[PDB]
Ligand binder design. Structure first.
Ligand SMILES: [K+]
Ligand SMILES: [Mg+2]
Ligand SMILES: [Mg+2]
Ligand code: NA
Lengths: 240, 151, 156, 124
RNA sequence: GGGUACGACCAUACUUGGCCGAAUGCACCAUAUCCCGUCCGAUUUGUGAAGUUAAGCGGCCACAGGCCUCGUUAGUACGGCGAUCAGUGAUGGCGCUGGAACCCGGGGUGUUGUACUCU
RNA sequence: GAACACAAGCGUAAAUGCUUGCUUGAUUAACGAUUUCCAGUACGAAUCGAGACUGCGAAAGCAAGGCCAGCGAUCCUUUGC
RNA sequence: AAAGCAAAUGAUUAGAGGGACCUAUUCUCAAACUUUAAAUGUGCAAACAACCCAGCCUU
């Protein structure tokens, strides 16, 4: 048969980008995420990079540069046991916790704490955060820190843990533009978000029900510690 | 006299390269332009939007206007017995920063550095000198090389 | 050797190529539904030529056992492939034991079974896709040996 | 060239190769000079200075016949041509005297009508 | 001395085959009550470790193909300017000068930024 | 080495191709600027913008037709505000 | 221009190793073929209506 991969094939071959070969970067989306108005002469633009592995949740704030991307702040799921969560570390509740940590640490670094404290009581309702592009009729007050969500190659479905990290960052004080169309409680028929269903997922009621069912299957608490964890992060986010 | 459209002699002019096809990279996206800069106008041929006319490929000019996704450049063009200053609007992908003044700027930086050091050189081959060979060969046009030029 | 190199059945694909559209396809689609207890899909050239379905799991193993019983637990040597998969076909669904109703009629089908190890996810996952590897790939001889160990019987 | 070789020698004592192919197409106009672009009429070969047109390889005892055969064939060509004896060995890029030693050493890979010297670089 | 995440240049980084791999990891892997999507939890989505370094990943090797670089081809091919130059012509050399390419031979087979991290 | 309505060239692989879901940026756009032909006139075509109302997206973002060929003065008639 | 077909597209001669077919070669080519690629060319810059530094003002 005709043999492909001869000498002529290798001479004419053009290799793709290194990170495209490794299957790590979508350069079609990355080009739009870094693009900025030329009338803004190089003013900083930040990204919120969220990557979830088989055993970890990673949240980073990244500023793109020609020499190489620069990471301003990073939070990981394995630092949660220092705050009070020693199980899960991958579930939706851990996604919320790490989003709060990265938002709290970044505001602490900038000195912008004790302002833009976010919400104190946790609820699943929509926020409609304030940005320069679309503000809520107010221009006198100081604007919050802004970043745009970067989910990478993950498939963006309703009630995914990537959008869990987004909610935690918004509740922590960051201004990441978004819509509630992808939150767990959102129903597309009525275009309404069940804040009750959302609130349970943040506090891990779905995990508790499955654990209780599993205990029953073997035969023949979580909400309280999550609340304590949220308080601990909001108190001393720089501990390590 | 037939068929003089916007892109007439552009088969090889707007061709990309050998083993260098694709779309502009991040380094191109992050370039900053400001009014008064010198730029080169080269087409990319992978971006159809905002591509200049074939005359302005390879030309160098100065920028007069910055827009959210575009740059305005002033370029000279001789018409009959005069040169007209033309203005073209192109996208930022078909524009590169020009290095036509780095030698001049480096000269200015050296001059101030020389004055700064003075406040706080070369060997001429043209002039003669002694030469000691220690060996001398001869060129004689041997008959062997005459026989060599026979394919 | 390694406790992760065992050969397992990945999927079982059943295809019925009636070559027609209409009531014949409707009966065939129902017949496949009762056989595998799972909704089938129609394949077209447009013309709606054939129907087929893919079965993976325990029900794939049970269906494979029933088809092998019809085929008398014997297969030819050239029925296999260098990829590591084989297949066959039966001519009568009544011989499979299914009760006969004098409305559907009698149909045949083609069975294909794909074997592999537990590392095949790497070539199929969306992020960081790669190639399996020469050692981990299942060869024809390994496939024939696997068929000799369980459901014995082969003729060259 | 073929006819003389058969008559004055054996048909199994020589091999002739024509090294010029007729790839160029000529035109004929065949109203006056209105719409004068012409139709194809024939074919020809474009040659240049120093180009080899014919090649004969044979044995040493038939070279007087080889020269005479080429002289008669040269009479059919326009322009000026010369007949020379190659320094190489029979359609090969190898010198006549060096070929015997290299063939003895065995470092000459053999192809039909041409010879490639063995290269040290490669899989053993 | 390594790992992970985000990168810049985009083969000295690719392709085939072979050998090896402490730790933190990465990964394969287990399973469908809930969110979510399929003919099929194969892909995707949610839960979590009972195992496994077999594969993925990293390092090394191959007179291996490719790729990069320096020489050789070669002052060769071709060229700008000059002649009341040669030649029937086709063409060519000379004077002042610019100057290649393939084949082939020697060498090489990624460099590195930000953050968190195991000796 | 396929496809992208049609002639050809250029271009493109988690796409500029194919399938699918939702849509009407093929609307309006204060006489903004410019390129090609060029007399630096018009017409045709095209590029970069400011304002309104929107579409698709979680977002960054993309879109005021289908890239470049596919079209028309004075006078008169007719429609809209 | 040259060079190349032992590199993509097109044309094309003959042998060799496993009648077609395959592998590696081989003779000869291209205004509407090309990896490579001159000479002669063609934009821009090489300061005073400007530049460098210091201290300020306004939006
Ligand atoms: K607008
Ligand atoms: Mg996307
Ligand atoms: Mg048009
Ligand atoms: Na070009």
């Amino acid at each position: 048969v005709k043999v492909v991969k001869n000498k002529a094939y290798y001479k004419r071959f053009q290799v793709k980008y290194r990170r495209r070969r490794e299957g790590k970067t979508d350069y079609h989306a990355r080009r739009r995420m870094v693009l900025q108005d030329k009338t803004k002469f190089g003013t900083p633009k930040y990204r919120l990079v969220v990557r979830i592995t088989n055993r970890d949740v990673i949240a980073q704030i990244v500023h793109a540069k020609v020499v190489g991307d620069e990471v301003v702040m990073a939070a990981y799921s394995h630092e949660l046991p220092l705050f009070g969560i020693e199980h899960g570390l991958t579930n939706y509740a851990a996604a919320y916790a790490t989003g709060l940590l990265v938002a709290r640490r970044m505001l602490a670094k900038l000195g912008l704490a004790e302002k833009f404290v976010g919400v104190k009581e946790v609820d699943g309702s929509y926020a409609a955060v304030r940005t320069k592009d679309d503000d809520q009729g107010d221009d006198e007050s100081r604007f919050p820190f802004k970043a745009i969500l970067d989910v990478g190659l993950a498939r963006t479905t309703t009630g995914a843990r990537v959008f869990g990290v987004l909610k935690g960052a918004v509740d922590g004080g960051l201004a990441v533009p978004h819509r509630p169309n992808r939150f767990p409680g959102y129903n597309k028929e009525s275009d309404a978000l069940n804040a009750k269903v959302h609130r349970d997922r943040i506090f891990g009621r779905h995990v508790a029900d499955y654990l209780k069912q599993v205990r029953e299957e073997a035969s023949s608490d979580m909400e309280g510690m999550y609340k304590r964890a949220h308080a601990a992060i909001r108190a001393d986010p720089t501990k390590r | 006299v037939h068929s003089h459209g916007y892109k007439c002699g552009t088969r090889h002019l707007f061709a990309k390269k050998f083993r260098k096809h694709g779309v502009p990279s991040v380094s191109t996206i992050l370039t900053n332009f400001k009014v008064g800069d010198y730029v080169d106008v080269v087409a990319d041929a992978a971006v159809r939007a905002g591509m200049p006319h074939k005359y302005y490929h390879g030309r160098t000019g100065i920028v007069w206007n910055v827009t959210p996704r575009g740059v305005g450049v002033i370029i000279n063009k001789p018409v009959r017995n005069r040169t007209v200053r033309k203005r073209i609007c192109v996208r930022f992908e078909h524009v590169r920063k020009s290095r036509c003044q780095e030698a001049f700027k480096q000269k200015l930086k050296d001059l101030e550095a020389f004055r700064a050091a003075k406040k706080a050189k070369k060997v001429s081959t043209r002039n003669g000198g002694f030469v000691c060979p220690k060996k001398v060969e001869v060129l004689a046009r041997r008959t062997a090389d005459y026989e060599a030029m026979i394919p | 050797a390694n406790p992760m190199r065992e050969i397992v059945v990945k999927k079982l694909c059943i295809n019925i190529c009636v070559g027609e559209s209409g009531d014949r396809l409707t009966r065939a689609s129902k017949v496949l539904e009762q056989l595998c207890e799972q909704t089938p899909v129609l394949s077209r050239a447009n013309e709606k030529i054939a129907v087929h379905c893919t079965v993976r799991g325990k029900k794939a193993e049970e269906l494979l056992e029933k088809g092998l019983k019809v085929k008398e637990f014997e297969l030819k040597s050239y029925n296999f492939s260098d990829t590591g998969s084989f297949g066959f076909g039966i001519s009568e669904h009544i011989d499979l034991g299914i009760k006969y109703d004098p409305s559907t009629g009698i149909y045949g089908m083609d069975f294909y079974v794909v074997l592999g190890r537990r590392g095949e996810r790497v070539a199929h996952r969306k992020r960081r896709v790669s190639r399996v590897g020469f050692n981990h790939r299942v060869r024809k001889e390994e496939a024939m040996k696997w068929f000799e160990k369980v459901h014995d019987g082969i003729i060259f | 060239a073929n006819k003389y070789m058969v008559k004055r020698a054996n048909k199994e004592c020589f091999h002739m190769r024509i090294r010029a192919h007729p790839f160029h197409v000529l035109r004929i106009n065949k109203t006056g000079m209105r719409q004068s672009y012409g139709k194809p009429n024939g074919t020809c070969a474009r040659v240049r200075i120093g180009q080899i047109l014919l090649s004969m390889r044979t044995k040493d005892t038939y070279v007087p016949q080889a020269l005479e055969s080429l002289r008669r064939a040269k009479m059919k060509f326009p322009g000026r041509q010369i007949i020379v004896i190659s320094k190489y060995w029979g359609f090969t890029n190898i010198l006549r005297n060096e070929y015997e030693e290299l063939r003895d050493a065995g470092k000459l890979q053999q192809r039909g009508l041409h010879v490639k010297l063995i290269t040290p670089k490669g899989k053993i």
